[PDB]
Design a protein around this ligand. Structure first.
Ligand SMILES: NC(=O)c1ccc[n+]([C@@H]2O[C@H](COP(=O)([O-])OP(=O)(O)OC[C@H]3O[C@@H](n4cnc5c(N)ncnc54)[C@H](O)[C@@H]3O)[C@@H](O)[C@H]2O)c1
Ligand SMILES: NC(=O)[C@H]1CCCc2c1[nH]c1ccc(Cl)cc21
Ligand SMILES: [Cl-]
Ligand code: NA
Ligand SMILES: [Zn+2]
Length: 270
């Protein structure tokens, strides 16, 4: 059984030099963006105002074509620009500064990973981004910023060529995975450490990427709960730090001896 302390030692020793990271919506709850499924505050449990057939419909395409307003209203509330990265993001940014980060796979659309200053080449935005948009009819692409004013003004963005609804390049249920997701085949066999933070590991194939690392590779889960292959297909070098993601990240940072470097980092960036 490995401990959090053993992981920290591996990193300090550079026995782990190619960290791959998987994150989800739990890493952004501390920044004021709800996750999908936590009781009370989870997105799926507060969508009454939108009078949907069921909660998941607000991120499905066929509902979107029937009525795009509910999604765009929610998207106004979620639109990037003023939310800030938290310590979870800055710790990942610190892995990259210290040359330890192979790749950061994210399910979030909030953009906070980039905002924390991790360069785009190290990121795989597995569920897309607000940075670009696409006409849902004629497939003409647009910079995402060209729909921001419409969104902020409660209007449905329309294509100036064809008048079709223009949608940010967020991956809706059952839409195609983006092309950068295809990097998983190259990254996962090279990982020598896997960190998973703030995700329920419910969606496939994303969740399965946890099994795609070599079985000798330690998998460290920082999350409220024990989830996915860490719960159902455990391996002998798995470590779980359960509880608040920020407290978990801080504990790790302390064992690593990075407390003052983080403080200094979070100061400069903020
Ligand atoms: N393209 C897609 O697959 C698509 C499209 C639309 C929606 N979704 C949604 O994506 C979801 C999967 O996303 P996810 O894993 O990013 O989010 P989630 O909300 O399913 O999981 C969040 C995890 O973080 C934990 N958590 C939340 N805040 C935390 C905190 N402060 N500290 C510690 N733990 C915390 C929760 O317990 C949970 O395990 C699916 O359930 C689906 O509804 C996916
Ligand atoms: N923090 C996030 O970015 C999360 C939580 C806010 C809504 C959201 C997130 N991920 C998503 C993936 C796809 C779609 Cl359609 C929406 C989301
Ligand atoms: Cl599983
Ligand atoms: Na799986
Ligand atoms: Zn068009």
């Amino acid at each position: 059984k490995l401990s959090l302390q053993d992981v920290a030692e591996l990193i300090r020793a550079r026995a782990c030099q190619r960290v791959v990271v998987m994150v989800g919506a739990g890493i952004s709850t501390p920044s004021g963006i709800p996750d999908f499924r936590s009781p009370g505050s989870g997105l799926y449990s507060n969508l009454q105002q939108y009078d949907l057939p069921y909660p998941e419909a607000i991120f499905e395409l066929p509902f979107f074509f029937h009525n795009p307003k509910p999604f765009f209203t929610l998207a106004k509330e979620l639109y990037p620009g003023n939310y800030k990265p938290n310590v979870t993001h800055y710790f990942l940014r610190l892995l990259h500064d210290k040359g330890l980060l192979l790749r950061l796979y994210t399910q979030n659309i909030d953009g906070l990973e980039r905002v924390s200053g991790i360069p785009a080449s190290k990121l795989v935005e597995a569920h897309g981004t607000f940075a670009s948009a696409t006409c849902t009819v004629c497939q003409r692409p647009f910079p995402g910023e060209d729909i921001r004013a419409d969104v902020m003004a409660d209007r449905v963005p329309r294509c100036p060529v064809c008048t079709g609804v223009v949608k940010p390049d967020i991956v809706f249920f059952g839409e195609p995975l983006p092309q950068r997701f295809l990097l998983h085949v190259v990254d996962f066999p090279m990982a020598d450490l896997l960190l998973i933070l703030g995700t329920s590991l419910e969606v496939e194939p994303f969740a399965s990427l946890t099994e795609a690392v070599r079985s000798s590779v330690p998998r460290l889960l920082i999350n409220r709960d024990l989830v996915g292959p860490l719960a159902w297909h455990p391996r002998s070098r798995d470590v779980a730090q359960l509880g608040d993601v920020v407290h978990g990240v801080e504990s790790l940072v302390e064992l690593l001896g990075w407390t003052e470097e983080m403080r200094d980092l979070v100061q400069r960036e903020t």
